[PDB]
């Protein structure tokens, strides 16, 4: 007598949907699991018509190949959830159901936010289209880069290095993600000198420059104190670690950003703790839809070339999920439900770390124009030449695409040619004597 | 990761078995038709690397020649593929312990001289 | 041809839908009109097809020659969230001035659920409100003092106390009383506050008075609303129309923040909703008040005047969560509210006691029966008469009686227990028409 | 404004939405620079899913400053501060002020008279000119036999 498993229920459009994958313990039948998961996340107690509030588990299927793994689909009434509150959404869905003694492992795979609920969130403070008009950057991805090292570098000097980069032809620069306010680099100082670099480099290049200032702080009070002061300096962009800081603190910051027209970069520190394992946790695909909802203009989607296949398809999927307005359900790219966004603006995926210049044509063919290609560390001539190299390589790539060339099959040449014009680009390319495997012939 | 590695090895093997299918028809046609076997040798020189970019090049010129190798590469793999895995693993395992043995003997040569 | 008249377009759920009734001028084809009305209210590098408002069905109102109903679909992007003002401005702003139309009237609007989700709505609404007032199982009583000015706040205060102690739930500020030279608002508030406190203590029942916060400026309105909050007043009133939707939307959020019930008076509505051929019908405005924010709303008396069929409809619309389209009651499109709470309809003006059993059977327990003036014995016995009359009716219903064909007796019977109710009934020697028999 | 001896020239931009801030702004500049005193927001433009006011205001401001410096003539665009709440309506006027805009617009009828009285005082306090669009006037003032005549609403405005 289990009213939490309804195999015939066709979901309403206004429902919230969730796809879990689970390994049931020896003995537990799959329908017992999906129902318990449904009950716990919703009502769960076991004269009214409660039916409205009870979350229903409406479909169960075994994962192709994998033995002892099932997908469980659950529908949630629009009334279960507080507005604008991802926090509440999370607490409702991932709050408890992960601890079940009758479950070996549970992983949340995707969520269908109903348009009716999406409408109650602010979303990105600006989003792709607005931000291009704000920065005046069009027709190409955006170039950023990270400064190494972390601390052990004075404000005056960090700032100097930031200037060297931006002046060398890069759009953005970023604080190391564990840089907040330590015994030898208090934020107020980092902010002063970074601001100075932007203003100078910007005037010198005649191009809009920005550095993501890490306002991530201990308290909401402190976090605001910094954003407030980054505003005072006329900075166009700040960064925030949405996961380690938390979703409440973020929702707050993302609104403030819209009010002060400050762009909001989002670093996913500590994501790997949750999203790494195939069998347990939450997938980054979900956290990304969440980060879209709470708020933010950029978001680190990780690179697609260091990591291999299956990240590829899954990453392409959720890049689409944070960029577009309507996303067709496609299981092969890891998209479980069709997602709409009702004209909620898109988030710029940020391809971060482990990537150097050679990757450039690939990155452009994969991510296209609406991306941020970060480049942290290192060119044999310094920051500026390194920046120039990366910049020319990019400019060369875009035009080669627009001319109509195959960035996979021709990536090599498109760079080698451009290199005959930028000695900085030459030095960099020549730094990587690349390896190719041919089998023995004759 | 491993799902990616095997998908690669299979496509490389499929490209290398295309090379070996060309080498058998060239040996079987190196006697029956020397002039035409000489032409095929000239055209395919350096085009061996990609198996599917080679067949698309031979279909664009001599269609009868491309379909032949297709039947040949299909016959070879349906015959020799079954035996492959055993030979690779025990081949590597042999090679490996042999390289380690020689390393331990090289280790002991640096041992007693120290 | 016109891309604003699309006779095949099926509305997406997320659309905003509007039903207009118009007479086109001699010569003007209907489709042209429906399309211009569509074009003007919406939009007119053309991937514009998203943002255009489409006119997707036109039909002739049965009977009435030269009358058409035009249905227009609007995309969820045209409208600012939580803005009833912008909703109007986008829909009614300009389409009413067309020289090609003799007259235009806005009958109904389907607010999609995705848009509704972006409005607060009632700061409390029926369900909650009862839990707060502790009143259950019967419609709530109120009544209007008479006259307005010419009464010192001390006396208005004394008059109010007479009524609340007489067994009423609420009393009301005469709607054109804000702050005039001979009744400054803060004084009224003081003495009304004191009348509630006394009468509530003596009766052991929650008492209320709709304090009239309506003011010249927003600044001023808040000054009043929240000094009223300072007094511990349970309810305040607002003329949503003459004040403005923006000004209201504001007050309603404040009311939810401060847990103060909101009584909405529909002043000026007749200027817009009266005429069949031109304007906006009240059912629309009623939905917009539900959307803006308000816990009570004068839905007008039912028993005077067609009125009935159309009134019951929008009463349903401001109370229920789901409302099935039913043209015969005025419901043009099905309406969901997605758990947005209902507004208590208020039956105002013209009604004395004889109407009681009608009013109960028509409106039910979730309504406010307002009784503005006059009982031969004073305010208190008037209030007692009207309470007993009501209690008598709620019980007569619960026992299973027919409030239409039995109303007479039900009152004459309980009339023999309240001498105050007896004298009230005596005042109206009823008229019944019998045809010459024998 | 320093404009004397002639009426004042304004103009409306078509179309409504389906136009980015950067681009609406561009069109506003094109007009003002071409020798017009004023420009105006479409009266149903407040803050929609594809043109949030804060952005419309930024780019309009830029057009005014540029065109003004280029023509050597005082330029203005009526910014539509009409909003859902008094709080929000003020938030915008406050920010139009911050940009040094000489003129804002407001829909007195659909917004309501209370909200307006408020805005009109604020304007005097901040010396910001106040344009008034009569959206929805036709609902009341059209019919000869019923309603209120615009003549009255004008004395009221």
> Which range does the strand content of chain B fall in?
under 5%
What percent of residues of chain A are in strands?
15-25%
What is the chains' assembly state? part of a larger assembly
What is the number of strand segments of chain B? 0
Protein structure class of chain B: mainly alpha
| CATH architecture call of the largest domain in chain A | Alpha-Beta Barrel
Total number of distinct structural domains of chain A: 2
What structural class do you assign from the helix and strand content of chain A? alpha/beta
Please report the first level of CATH classification, the CATH class of the largest domain in chain A.
Alpha Beta
PDB class: photosynthesis
Keywords: photosynthesis, assembly chaperone, TIM barrel (RbcL), carbon fixation (RbcL) complex assembly, chaperone (RbcX), RbcS (RbcL)
Entry title: Crystal structure of a chaperone-bound assembly intermediate of form I Rubisco
Chains A, C, D: Ribulose bisphosphate carboxylase large chain
Summarize this structure briefly.
Chain A has 442 residues and is α/β, with parallel strands linked by helices.
Give a structural overview.
- The structure is cut from a larger assembly and holds three copies of chain A and one copy of chain B (114 residues).
- With 442 residues, chain A is α/β, with parallel strands linked by helices.
- Chain A has two domains: 121 residues, RuBisCO large subunit, N-terminal domain (Alpha-Beta Plaits, 2-Layer Sandwich); 321 residues, Alpha-Beta Barrel (TIM Barrel), CATH 3.20.20.
- Helices cover 38% and strands 15% of the residues of chain A.
- Chain A contains 16 helices and 15 strands.
- Chain A has a five-stranded mixed sheet. In chain A, strands 5-15-14-11 form a four-stranded parallel sheet, with helices on one face. In chain A, strands 6-7-8-9 form a four-stranded parallel sheet.
- Chain A is globular.
- Chain A starts with 15 loop residues before the first strand and ends in a 12-residue tail after the last helix.
- With 114 residues, chain B is mostly helical.
- Chain B has a single domain, classed as Chaperonin-like RbcX (Non-ribosomal Peptide Synthetase Peptidyl Carrier Protein, Chain A), CATH 1.10.1200.
- In chain B, 86% of the residues lie in helices and 0% in strands.
- Chain B contains five helices and no strands.
- Chain B is elongated, with a radius of gyration of 21 Å.
- Chain B starts with a helix and ends with a helix.
- Classes of the chains: A alpha/beta (442), B mainly alpha (114).
- Chains in contact: A-B, A-C, A-D, C-D.
- The PDB classes it as photosynthesis.
- The entry lists the keywords photosynthesis, assembly chaperone, TIM barrel (RbcL), carbon fixation (RbcL) complex assembly, protein folding, chaperone (RbcX), RbcS (RbcL).
- The entry is titled "Crystal structure of a chaperone-bound assembly intermediate of form I Rubisco".
- Chains A, C, D are Ribulose bisphosphate carboxylase large chain.
